[PDB]
Symmetry: D2
Amino acid sequence: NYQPTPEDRFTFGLWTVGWQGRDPFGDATRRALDPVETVQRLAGLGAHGVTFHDDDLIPFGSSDTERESHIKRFRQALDATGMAVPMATTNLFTHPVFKDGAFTANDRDVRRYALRKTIRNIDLAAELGAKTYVAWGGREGAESGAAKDVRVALDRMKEAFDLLGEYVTAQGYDLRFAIEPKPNEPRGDILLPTVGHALAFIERLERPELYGVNPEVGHEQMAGLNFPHGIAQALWAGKLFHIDLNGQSGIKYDQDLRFGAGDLRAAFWLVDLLESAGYEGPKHFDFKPPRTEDLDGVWASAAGCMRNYLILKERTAAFRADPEVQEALRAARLDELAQPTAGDGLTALLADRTAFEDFDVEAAAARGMAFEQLDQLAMDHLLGAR
Amino acid sequence: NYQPTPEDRFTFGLWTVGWQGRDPFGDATRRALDPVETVQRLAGLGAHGVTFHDDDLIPFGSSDTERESHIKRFRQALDATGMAVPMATTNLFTHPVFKDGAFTANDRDVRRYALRKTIRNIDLAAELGAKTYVAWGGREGAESGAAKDVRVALDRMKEAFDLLGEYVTAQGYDLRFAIEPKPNEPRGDILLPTVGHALAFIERLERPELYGVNPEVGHEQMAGLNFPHGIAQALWAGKLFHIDLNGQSGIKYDQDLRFGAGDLRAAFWLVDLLESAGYEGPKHFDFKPPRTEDLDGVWASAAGCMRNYLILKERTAAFRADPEVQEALRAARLDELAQPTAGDGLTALLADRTAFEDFDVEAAAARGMAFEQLDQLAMDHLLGAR
Amino acid sequence: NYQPTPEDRFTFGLWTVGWQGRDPFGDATRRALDPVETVQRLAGLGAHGVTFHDDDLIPFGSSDTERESHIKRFRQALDATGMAVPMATTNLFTHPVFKDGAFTANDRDVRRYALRKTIRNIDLAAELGAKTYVAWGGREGAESGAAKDVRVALDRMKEAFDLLGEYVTAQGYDLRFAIEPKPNEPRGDILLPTVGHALAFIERLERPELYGVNPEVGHEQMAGLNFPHGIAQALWAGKLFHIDLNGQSGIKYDQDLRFGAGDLRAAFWLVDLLESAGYEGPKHFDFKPPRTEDLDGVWASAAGCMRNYLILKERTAAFRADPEVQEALRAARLDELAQPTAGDGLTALLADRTAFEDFDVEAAAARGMAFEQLDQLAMDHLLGAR
Amino acid sequence: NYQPTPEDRFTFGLWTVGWQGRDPFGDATRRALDPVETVQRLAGLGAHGVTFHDDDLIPFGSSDTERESHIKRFRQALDATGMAVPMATTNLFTHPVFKDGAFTANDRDVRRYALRKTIRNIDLAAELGAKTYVAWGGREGAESGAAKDVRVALDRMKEAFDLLGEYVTAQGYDLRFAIEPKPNEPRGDILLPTVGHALAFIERLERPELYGVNPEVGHEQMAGLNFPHGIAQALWAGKLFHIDLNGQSGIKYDQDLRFGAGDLRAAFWLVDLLESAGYEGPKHFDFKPPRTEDLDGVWASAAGCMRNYLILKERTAAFRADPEVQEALRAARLDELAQPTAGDGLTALLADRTAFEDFDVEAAAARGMAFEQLDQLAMDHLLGAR
Ligand SMILES: [Mg+2]
Ligand SMILES: [Mg+2]
Ligand SMILES: [Mg+2]
Ligand SMILES: [Mg+2]
Ligand SMILES: [Mg+2]
Ligand SMILES: [Mg+2]
Ligand SMILES: [Mg+2]
Ligand SMILES: [Mg+2]
C-alpha cells in the first residue's frame, strides 16, 4: 500500500484543487470550491494540512464582520478534521492594482498597500498556527528594460522584507519567511529569479535569520536548472524553510503538473535528498489539476501527488540500502569527496610534492568514474527492475 | 568614428582570437596563435589588455626553464606594446584528469593538484599586475544524480576558495577572486549555475570580501535569464569585480558570439546599466570567432566587439539625455520607485489609513504605466530613429 | 517619420488591441473594446485593415438577429474608414467545451460542433471579403501520453481540413486556408508544433493547394527556432499565405510582445526576406499590449509595430543596396550558392576528378568565409552606424 | 533479466561506443576503438548489429588498397559474429572543408566533393547489406543572417538528395534515404531543424518515396518538442525509416545520454508507440558514453540502453493489456477519437441540428476527460506499483 497518513506531512494549497481552469486562452471549466470543503475532502485523502492565500479564504472587499466569519468557518473545519495550516501567503498578483508590482511597484501608494495587506494576513497565520509565511513576488519584474531599475527595486524589496520582519519581531510571532522564486510568467522577467538569487538577497537583509526560501520544482525547471542541486545549496545554507512540489515538462509555461510527472528521474533524486537530509518540514504540493478534469479527477490528481512521492520514498531508500549501490558509490569515490582536501593545511599542501611534481596526472586521468554503473543501479531501483 | 582607445578599457582573452575552431563535431580550422602575436595584433586594434589561462601562456608539462621564458617573452610583448593583464585564470577543465572536477573532484589527489596548479598561476598574475583572478568551475558538476553529493561538494569548493584566500592574504597580493558561473556545457549541470548562486556561496565563505562574480552574457542567456538584471543584483551587492561580454542566440550550446550579436536589445540595456553605475573595471570579451573564419575574420570580429559596445554607449547616453525620455521616465514613476516606501516607519505606516482603508485600489489600478511609450523611445534611440 | 499608410498592408487583430490583460495569474486591467472603435482608431494610425475571431464580433450564444446587427455595424465602419477584413478565424479554444480539443477532441459531437462553428464563419469571411482563413489548434494537443493517439488525431485533423476544403470548393469562395502552428500553451504539447510540421500535414490533404501557413514569430522562438529560416521554407514550398508579426524574449510563454522587441536582428532578417521575396500579402500583428498599459499605451503599441517594421524596411533595403555589402556577399560566395551544384549531371560529376581525386581539400578549407565582416556591415546598417 | 537478443534488432554506431571524450572544452579521455573490437563486444552484449560513418571505417586519405583491407577486416568480423550493418552514413562535418556546409556550402567544389564522398559510401552500404542511408546536415546552417539564403540552400539540398536518388535508382540498390533532423549544434541554426521540417522537404523531391526520417530523441528535446508525437507524424506519413535512441535533459547541448535517462516518461511513450505500430526497423542507439567513464563503463552504457528499452517494453505492454487501463481509455473516449468525425458527409453534418442548434454545449463541457486517472495508471505501470 502506498497510502498517505498525516504523518507523511503532505500539504496542499486551497488554490491547487480549487483551480477552476481559467487559463490565458480559455475560461473556467470547474466551479469554485469552498475552503471548508477542500479541507474536508483533502483530509479523507490523507493530508496533514492546507495552506492558503488571503484572497482564497477572505474575499477581496470583505468587511471585518465577513472576515471573522470566513475565518471561524475555516477553523471549525480544521478543528473538526484535524487539518493543519503550516504556511500562508498573500495574493499580491491577481488584482489590477498589482500590475507593475506590490513591494517593488513604481507607485508608492501601491507599495504601501501591499505591505498592509501582507501584515494583515501575517496576523492571521499567527493565530492559526502557521510557522512559515511564503512570498511569491510574481508581479515584481518587467517586460521592458527602462520600466524598472533593478538596483532601486531591490532596495524597495529589502525595505519591505525588513519592515515585515520588524513587525514579526515586535509582535513576537513564531514565524519565518520564505521567498518563492520564479524566473518568468506572469511578468517577462521576475526579480529574484532562482533559489540562488533569493539566497543572496537574504544575506543582504537586516535580520537574515528570519528569511529563507520556498523552492518550486517547475520554477527551476522553467530555467533549465536542476532543482535537486538547488535544494542542496539551500540545505547546505540552512535556508530550506519550505518546499513546493509539482511537475514541469520543459522550458515552457508554468504547467503546475502533479508531482512525479514531468521529469520523473529528478523527482527520484529530490526524494533521495530530502530524505537523506531529514527534511522535517511540510511537503507542500502546488499543482493545478488540468482544466480537462472534474472534481473526481481533481482528487485523483491530489492522491497521485502523494502516491508518487511515497513510491519514490520506497525506491530511493531501497537504492541507498543496496550493498551493490553502496559498493558502486565506493567505486565512484563518493566517500573520498567527503574527505577534506587539505586538512593538513596550506603550508603542508604546498610542501606535498605528491600534489604536484610527483603526481601522475596520467594514471589518475586513466581512472574511470564508474558513474554509468551507479546510475543504472538507480534506474533499476526507480523502475523496480532489481 | 566608433574607434577604441585603450581608455575604453577593452580586454580580450588569448583563447578568444586564438580559438582554432575545434568543436565537438569537428576539427580545427585555424592554426594556433602565439601569445606574443595576439598581444601585438590586439594592441593595434585599440585594446587595453589581454587576459590569459595558465595553459595558454605556459604549455602543460613545461619545465621551469621553459616556463620563465614563455613568461619573459610575454612580458617583453606587453611592455613594448603597452598592454595590460587585468585578469588571469587556470585551465582546470581541458586535461583528462579534470574529467569529474578540479576543486570538487571525487578523488582527493585531483583536488589537491587543482589547488597547486591554481596557486602557481596566482603567483604569476601577482607579478604581472593582475588585480582579479577568475575561476570557472566548468567541470564541477555531474551528468547523473548519485555521482556527486552537492552538499559535500560545496564543502570542497568552500575549502578550496578559503584556502586560495588564505594564500593571497598570507602573500599580501592585491588580488580579488571572481567566480564565472555557467549552468551547463561541458557538464550536464554545473555547480554555482547562476550569478545569484555564486553570490550566495560567497557569503558562506570565511573572507567573503575577497570574492566576487565574473558574469558572462551567454552563460545567463543559456538559462533564459536577463543578464542586465543579474549585473544589477551583483552591482547592488558590490560584487561585480569583473564581467565577460559576448552573444548568445537562445537557450542552446555556448556560442560565445561577438558582443552586440545575439540579443541586441539586452546589450543596449547592459551598456546602459554599466555606464549608469560607473563600472570602472575591465570590459572583457569572451568570444570565439567562428570556425568558418580566417585570421582576418578573427580581428574583424574582435573590432566589432569594440565597435558595437561603443555605438551602444552613444545610443544609451543619448537615450538618458533626451528630455522626452526623462519626461517618460517620470510618466512611468521611476522617480517614485527611488522614494522609500515607509520612511515614516512601520508604526506610522500601520496608522496610515490612506495605505489601506482609505486607499482607492480602483483609481490606482486604472493608472497606466506608460511603459510602451518609454520603450519605443528606447528602440528609436538604439536604432537612431529619433 | 517612418509613418504608415494603408498601402503598407499593415493589418491587426481585434483581439490584439482588444486584450483586457487577463493572464493566468491576474484579472483584466483594461475594458473590452468595440470593433467599430478599433476599426476607426487603427484607421487613423495608418493600417490597411483588421482581422477577427468569430466570438470577437458576434458574442457567443447570439441569436441570428443580434448576429446580423453586429455584422452590419462592423461593415458600416469598414466601408466608412476604407479598412478591409483580409483574414478571419474561429475561436475554438475559449469555451470549456473545447478543453480537450476541437477537431481532435476525443468526443465526436464536439468535433462536429467545431466544423459547424467554423463553416459558419467561413461564410462570413467570404462576405466581408477575406481571402485567407486561419486555423490555430491551441486546444489540439495533450499533457498526458495516453490521452491522445496522435496518429488517430491527425486522421481527425485531415478529415476536418478536408471537409473544410470540400465546402469552400463547392461554394466557389475565393478563400484559402492557412495553419497557424504553435508548439505549446494552452496545452502541454500542441499538435502540428512548427511551420515544417504543418507543411507536411498539408501535403497529406486531398486538395493541398488550398492550404498554407500562418507563421507567428513568437511561436517558432518558443521552440528556439529561426523564424526567418522557417518563413524561407514556406516561401520555398509556396505555402506562406499569411504572416503573424510579434515579439518574444526566448523560450518561455507566448509573450506576444510588440514587433521589434524581443530579437531585433531576427526582425531585421525577416523584413529582409519578406521584402526580397515580394510577400504581397497582409503584414499582420498578433501582439498583446501589455497589461501594465492604458488604452493610450495600447494605441502607442500598434503604432510601434508599424513604425518598427518600416524602420527595418529602410535599413534592410539600404543594406542590400550598399555597394560594400554587395562586395561582401561575393566574398562570402553567396553568388556561388546560386550556381547549381551539378548542372553537368550525375554521370559527369562521377567522371570529374576535380570533385574528388584532384580536389585540393586543404586549400578550400583554408579559404575564409568572410561571414563576420558581412554581419558587422548588417549590424551597422541596422543601427545607423555605416 | 530483461536481457537482449539479436532478434530485438538493437543496433549501435561505431562512433557511439567509440567516442573518445573530446568535447569543446576538453581533450579525449578514452582511446580510439577498432571496429572489429566493437563488433565483437557488442555481439556478446546481445546486439543485432552496428552502423558506421565513412571515416569511422576507412581513415580519411586512405588509398584504395588500404580501403579494401579495412572493409575486409570489418566484414570478416561481421560474418563471424552474425552482426549486420543495417545503415550507413557519411561524415560531412569533421573536416575543415565542411565548415560552411556540405551540400549547402557556399562553394560549389565542396558541394560536389560531398556528393562524391557520399556516393562512394552508398556503394559500400549496398555491399555490406545496408537498407537505409542516413544524412545529417550538422554543418548545413549558419550563425549569421546574410551567410546563407535558405531558399537557395534548399534548392541545393533538393539537387543533392535528387542526384542521390538518381544514382541509387540507376544502380538498382535496395537502399532508402533517411534524414536525421537536428535543430542546432555544431551550427547556430541547422537547416531542416525538426522531423516536420524534413517531412515537408521530402515531399518536394523528385522521387519522394526513397526518402524518410531518422529521428533522434535528443534532437527534438533540444527544441522542447515531444518525440513520441513527432514519431507519430512520421508513422502517419509513412516516413519512419530509422530511429536514433538516446537521452537528453532538456533544452541544452546534444548530451547524447544513454536511452532511458533524461525523460523516462517520454521513453515510456516512445516504446508504447513503437511497439503498438509494429516498427519492424532497427532500434538504433546514438548515445555518447560519458567522458567520465572507462571502457568498462562504455560497455555498461550500451548494456543499459538495451536493458532500459526492454524494461519499458515490459511495462508499456502490461499497461495496454491491463483491463483497468482498457476501461480508463473508454472513459477518456479514446475509442471515440477513432470514430470518423463525419462519416455522414458535409451536406449531412450541415443538415444536423445536434451539431449546432440542439447541441448541449454546457453538458459536453461539464463531462470530465478522466486523463489524470489514466496517467496515474501509466505511472504505476512504469514504476511497478500497480
Ligand atoms: Mg507555480
Ligand atoms: Mg508555489
Ligand atoms: Mg563561454
Ligand atoms: Mg568566460
Ligand atoms: Mg502568439
Ligand atoms: Mg496568432
Ligand atoms: Mg545527437
Ligand atoms: Mg544521430
